Structure 1
Amino acid sequence: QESVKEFLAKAKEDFLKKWENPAQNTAHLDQFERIKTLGTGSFGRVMLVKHMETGNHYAMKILDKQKVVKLKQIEHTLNEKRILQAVNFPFLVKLEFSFKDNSNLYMVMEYVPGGEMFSHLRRIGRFSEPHARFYAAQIVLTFEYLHSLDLIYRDLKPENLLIDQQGYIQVTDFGFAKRVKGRTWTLCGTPEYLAPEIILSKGYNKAVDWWALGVLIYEMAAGYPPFFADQPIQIYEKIVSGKVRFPSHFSSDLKDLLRNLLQVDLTKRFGNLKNGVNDIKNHKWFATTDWIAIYQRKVEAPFIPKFKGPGDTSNFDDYENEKCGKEFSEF
């Protein structure tokens, strides 16, 4: 505690002042480039651009307002915009500017040279155990920092985690995230990350994030999801059963803690009983995981991306009247 709690208090204090004065229409689409489309993502379009005035490469998250209205996801977009505009943490790439055109809206994000870790894991199959712990430590740090602000991400997929030039993972895709205290009945997202509580169609609290992170660690070490089925209904039934076989290479110390992380009992879920994250911090799987020293991210990374300039898309894939303007009144 001590310094760490003193910093957490300051972060929580500044977050409220940041949230109460959100910006809108920070820029127009007149100082960017159209070099390539980084991808689509969800139901939007992503493209790599360069700042005409400055030169810094910046990503642009385009999305149709008609898509937001027709997909019945407009309030989630506004919450995501506000949260991204107010976030303050080293673990994630910050949002710089916002665009609001009569056809679509763009969001300025920093250039991510390291790309998605999902493609890298597909290229290598299975990461080394310390390589897994290296990312898991920062993941736990960011998740507990989100707990220090009382928000629910409601989104956890392998492709959403990028990697920095320093090797630290880069967080993005704040769409499903929301700052709601208590239980929420809303249900959506990836079935592979669907907790039984969300599958049961009940009020969902922050407790499911521990199960999501445990599934992330387990799949990162295994290369295959612990829960998998041909049909989502069978996948939902398998997730409801809450039983899966550990890999042969799985260590007892890691697998035993994964049993507490994947415990069907939400009340008994690791990271929700009494201490928040202290029981996770003392776990032997984090026996050498310097939570405080990672605040500077000085640890030697398991692997570094082969960066060759911000304009190179080598890590990235090589592919190719506003609708209800009254709803989008703060973009």
Structure 2
Amino acid sequence: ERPTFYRQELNKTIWEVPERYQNLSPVGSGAYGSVCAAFDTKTGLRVAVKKLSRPFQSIIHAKRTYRELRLLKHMKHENVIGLLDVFTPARSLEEFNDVYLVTHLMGADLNNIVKCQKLTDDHVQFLIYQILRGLKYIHSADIIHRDLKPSNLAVNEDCELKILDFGLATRWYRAPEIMLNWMHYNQTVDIWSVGCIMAELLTGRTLFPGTDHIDQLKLILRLVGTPGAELLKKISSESARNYIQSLTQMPKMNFANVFIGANPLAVDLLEKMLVLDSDKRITAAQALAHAYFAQYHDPDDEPVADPYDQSFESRDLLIDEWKSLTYDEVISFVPPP
């Protein structure tokens, strides 16, 4: 049957949750809603419960709620945030107004683990491996993260890592094409980010700590060189081309000297991730097979996602339609094993 709910005032609204979730304590809040830590008596897990704010206030809010719930329900992988539970106190669609999402309580992100220090090479292999493993899965669903950074990487005390699309400096890890509003993005935009994160774990220093947009791009070109002919022939914007040919030629730096001291296999991998031309960057699948990850790579335990129907993105529906579709997704949810 339906669980027994209780009501408690938290973050200035009445939260109504199943009695399995105990000891709600706010962690934080913002425009999106707010989040309480709780204990799930049923599973023995520490969890985070998020009450969405204004989920159906407008067409756009409603479609965003639907998008969020669909994504969360589809993501079932150890290195990606997933859903333990979703609930509403409403007993019918007619009563449906509030959506609550439940996931594992997370207490630290990659910045907290790193502390601007060098990590050991073995530690970097393990962390980067997990990121790539999660990215293979995400990319296999025809999804691109687009803003992968340390603040979106949760890590527990066993340094098990999960990719998030939220947080628990902002542009230092972005692909250069993303910062130049290129569109037509490749999934390897995320691989650029992995390269920036990996470099920083090894060296203890941000790779491209630009002061602003143009400075970021200047630091990038100084390392990887100015665009070569092969890259230039794929640029359709006549302003971008003539600006690019007008810059002084700079060669690609010698990565072996830049990251001197590093495992030469790490250097090799960085050379394959941090390529300006997104078409020539290594994929997540290819990177998992790279010799750097030999102690962790298991081709039979690097799973891919089921096909992910994102056709709803192209649709323009009424608020009550998005609301109804969301309600269907709440009611049909089956918790993980």
Please report the TM-score for the alignment, with normalisation by the length of structure 1: 0.63
2:280 matched to 1:291? no
2:119 matched to 1:109? no
Residue 72 of structure 2: aligned partner: 84
Residue 29 of structure 1: aligned partner: 16
Task: Note the C-alpha offset of 1:241.
Answer: 6.1
Instruction: State how far apart, in whole Å, the 2-side matches of 1:59 and 1:218 are.
Output: 32
* Partner SS, residue 295 of structure 2: coil
Change in Cα spacing, 1:90 to 1:220, as seen in structure 2 (3 Å) is same
Task: Note the C-alpha offset of 1:59.
Answer: 0.4
Alignment of 1:101-180 (within 5 A): 105-112=99-106, 115-122=108-115, 125-164=117-156, 166-173=158-165
1:213 corresponds, among 177, 194, 200, to 194
Residue 5 of structure 1: aligned partner: none
Task: Note the C-alpha offset of 1:75.
Answer: 4.0
Q: Quick check: 1:153–1:174 contact (8 Å CA) kept in 2? A: no
The one-letter amino acid of 1:57's match is: R
Residue 260 of structure 1: aligned partner: 272
The one-character-per-residue Cα deviations of 1:26-77 (angstroms, maximum 9, x if unpaired) are x98323445433344895533201246666432013442289969x776454
Greater relative contact order, per chain length (Cα 8 Å cut-off, separation 6+): 1
Kindly, what percent of the aligned residue pairs are identical?
A: 26
Change in Cα spacing, 1:42 to 1:160, as seen in structure 2 (3 Å) is farther
The one-letter amino acid of 1:277's match is: A
Change in Cα spacing, 1:108 to 1:234, as seen in structure 2 (3 Å) is same
Q: Quick check: 1:195–1:212 contact (8 Å CA) kept in 2? A: yes
Instruction: State how far apart, in whole Å, the 2-side matches of 1:81 and 1:126 are.
Output: 37
How many positions carry a matched residue from both structures? Answer: 257
Q: Quick check: 2:146–2:174 contact (8 Å CA) kept in 1? A: no
2:263 corresponds, among 241, 244, 251, to 251
Please tell me the root mean square deviation across aligned C-alpha atoms, in Å: 3.8
Instruction: State how far apart, in whole Å, the 1-side matches of 2:81 and 2:154 are.
Output: 9
Please report the TM-score for the alignment, with normalisation by the length of structure 2: 0.62
Instruction: State how far apart, in whole Å, the 2-side matches of 1:261 and 1:241 are.
Output: 16
Instruction: State how far apart, in whole Å, the 1-side matches of 2:61 and 2:17 are.
Output: 27
* Partner SS, residue 267 of structure 1: helix
Task: Note the C-alpha offset of 1:254.
Answer: 1.6
Q: Quick check: 1:164–1:170 contact (8 Å CA) kept in 2? A: no
The one-letter amino acid of 2:204's match is: G
1:65 corresponds, among 54, 76, 94, to 54
* Partner SS, residue 49 of structure 1: strand
Of 49-58 and 191-200, more deviation after overlay is shown by 49-58
Q: Quick check: 1:80–1:174 contact (8 Å CA) kept in 2? A: no
Greater strand content: 2
Q: Quick check: 1:144–1:277 contact (8 Å CA) kept in 2? A: yes
Of 229-238 and 59-68, more deviation after overlay is shown by 59-68
The one-character-per-residue Cα deviations of 1:248-279 (angstroms, maximum 9, x if unpaired) are 433333223212211101111122xxxx723x
Q: Quick check: 2:127–2:161 contact (8 Å CA) kept in 1? A: yes
Q: What 5-or-longer segments of structure 2 have no aligned partner?
A: 6-14, 90-95, 225-252, 304-318, 328-337
Instruction: State how far apart, in whole Å, the 1-side matches of 2:61 and 2:192 are.
Output: 25
